[model samples]
Target: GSSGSSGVEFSTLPAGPPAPPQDVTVQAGVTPATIRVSWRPPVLTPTGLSNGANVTGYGVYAKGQRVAEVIFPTADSTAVELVRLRSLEAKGVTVRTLSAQGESVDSAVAAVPPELLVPPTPHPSGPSSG
Candidate 1:
């Protein structure tokens, strides 16, 4: 007796780092406590994964420090919360995508100015003594 299906076969191709994404862009959120980032996926498709596997996830960095990692499902550039950003400024923030094999190539850095609050105009005339 022989079954219609023989058996499942696995490929032996070694997994390599993901290819770099393209057309990377960034934007500043309305509030100082958030940032907007977006980019295109890699060209070549990766092995094993169904959906090309080119870009598995996205990593957001702030001032050369790793801030957060945005997964594929939630890959939107609308706005990302910059946790505890009251004192922190958005200077030199970077974004990059991760491959299925867990590799990343950083994109062009976007500089952020320190969030400043402007004071109201002062009165020119002196106060009258009542």
Candidate 2:
């Protein structure tokens, strides 16, 4: 058989917004009135393709308000103290992945239980009794 010239063509679609974080968990932070939020990176995009690398950061939300944002590169990060919060009440916490395109939908809510009391700063008894 004689060989004939042939060619193949290919194309790529622009990546869409990244997917939201998964398995979000929240706990009390190191100090009083503080909270710690953690989660797993996105495994897929809105179109069900791997998109973890597209994530630039995460948005930390509390009581339907965005409290802070933790930048990416570090697999784990923290959301510092949320002060002046009411005691014995549960606050809604959530996280969402952010990319160059835009932010993903909010992840499942994680509840952070209120603290009994906010920790106070330690006071010096006297100026350096050396």
Candidate 3:
């Protein structure tokens, strides 16, 4: 009788990575070489590969190399800035969803075009009327 006293339905996740983050977006930061990366958290699927696993953090990659790995208390937190050695190469980067089980496949590469790389504010051409 005790063996069937299940109060809550029990579910187990498969041993594998969770789904990748969604809408991965990257843009140039204040500096020409810095980049800001952002993405949405992975969805929880009861019948999918994730099997309702949780996402703990994210892994940021710069030009195919892992640049940073951050863990948050919850999975919703999604944002990071990377500034290393004037790395304009980070203009194009990818993000991966990380979890206790494993890491998901890297999201599609997000990038900022050259025209969007704005220089530091207070441009020399600005008006001096102030």
Candidate 4:
């Protein structure tokens, strides 16, 4: 007996809109001059409310490079602290978010100035008060 194979048929799960715009915000640092980056779920109008509408994860980029990503089951925000003031030689940082489907769009670049070793203020308490 001869057996003939039949063609297989397949279908794809419908895709929703690309993940909403990632809310990238930075918290100014005080000591050591750090940049705290944070993000929130993509904002979509009318609130799809569909599970698909929710962002599955987020991505963070620094110095024109991708640093990290936080997936669902975890909060939306992640932070990278830059120490050794020498490391801040880079120009700026930015971020973006990805949908469950792996599509992503970048956020605006946040400009970071170069590190300065000497404190601009030259007022010494006791010795070199100027």
Candidate 5:
């Protein structure tokens, strides 16, 4: 939209690009040095309206490159850490909500969260040689 570029509109069926995933999160995983990228299905429009589209699938991105694809996605489908990341610090993650209309823009970038480690120490003290 440059100067002198008046408004132009077009119409099509099934709408265009579903909304980005909601409740997007990046945090710790079950294993060490693992970050899980997950989110809930979009229930709003890109314009921030409550009405949204029917999502057909889910595509995850790391540094703008496609990494994982989840078919027949559901509200509880939160499998993303399995996307195989050696270091979450090196990758910026995002999720694309795909529908018959197309894919909505990438969700907010979810970089590796800070201070995620929670290593438990079962022993009260180190080796005690008596």
Candidate 6:
């Protein structure tokens, strides 16, 4: 005869991280050298699951370089302003969400159209003068 003892058993498993922000949009800001960025926050399901963890802040990238980092009180933050950009030039801007766990995948690239530069009118040719 063999006797076996059974006790409480538990297992720990890891889960994937949260999802990234979506629908990121960018436009000219109040100034010619600034840019306005907006996005939709990630949604959480009722199953205690989410696209990703709660967002803490955002990273703004310009031409493959980090420009700014905006922190939010909660995960509801969705907009930020970027200043001191090159005017009259076609520049690329990208955005990514930051969570307690880690940063989410980058959003689609957005292009800021070149600024409108108005040229001065030339003076009409005048008759021969002394």
Q: Pick the candidate with the highest TM-score.
A: 2
- What shift in Å separates residue 124 of candidate 6 from its native position after superposition? 14
lDDT values, one for every candidate: 0.56, 0.63, 0.61, 0.52, 0.61, 0.55
Sum up the clashes in candidate 4: 0
TM-scores for the candidates: 0.55, 0.61, 0.59, 0.52, 0.56, 0.57
How accurate locally is residue 82 in candidate 3, as Cα lDDT from 0 to 100? 51
Segments of candidate 4 deviating more than 4 angstroms: 1-7, 13-17, 20-23, 28-33, 44-54, 72-76, 83-88, 113-130
- Which scores greater on lDDT, model 1 or model 4? 1
How many clashes would you count in candidate 2? 0
Which pairs clash in model 5? none
Residue-wise C-alpha lDDT for candidate 2, range 1-130, written one tens digit per residue: 1597645665746764566767777766776667777788745556434453366677877665667688772335466456523432336677777666667778878766544234566775867777
The Cα RMSD of model 5 versus the native structure comes to 6.6
- The weakest ten consecutive residues by lDDT in model 4 span 111-120
Q: lDDT for model 6, on a 0 to 1 scale?
A: 0.55
lDDT of 3 at 84: 40
Off by over 4 Å in 6: 1-16, 45-52, 73-90, 116-130
**Which tens-of-lDDT digit does each residue in 13-32 have in candidate 3?**
46656677767776545545
RMSD of 1: 8.6
Worst ten-residue run, lDDT, model 3?
72-81
Q: How do these models rank on TM-score, best leading?
A: 2, 3, 6, 5, 1, 4
Q: For candidate 1, what is the lDDT?
A: 0.56
Please give the lDDT score for candidate 4: 0.52
* Model 1 residue pairs with clashes: none
lDDT, candidate 6, 20-94, per-residue tens? 566666654554445566666666565433453655677767665666567751233333334324432325566
Which parts of model 3 are misplaced by more than 4 Å? 1-13, 27-34, 45-54, 73-79, 85-88, 113-118, 125-130
If both were scored by TM-score, which would come out higher, candidate 1 or candidate 2? 2
lDDT of 4 by residue, 8-122 (tens): 7766566544554445666644544455555556545465322344456556666555665666423444554554323545455565555555545566655545442223465
Worst 10 residues of 2 by lDDT: 81-90
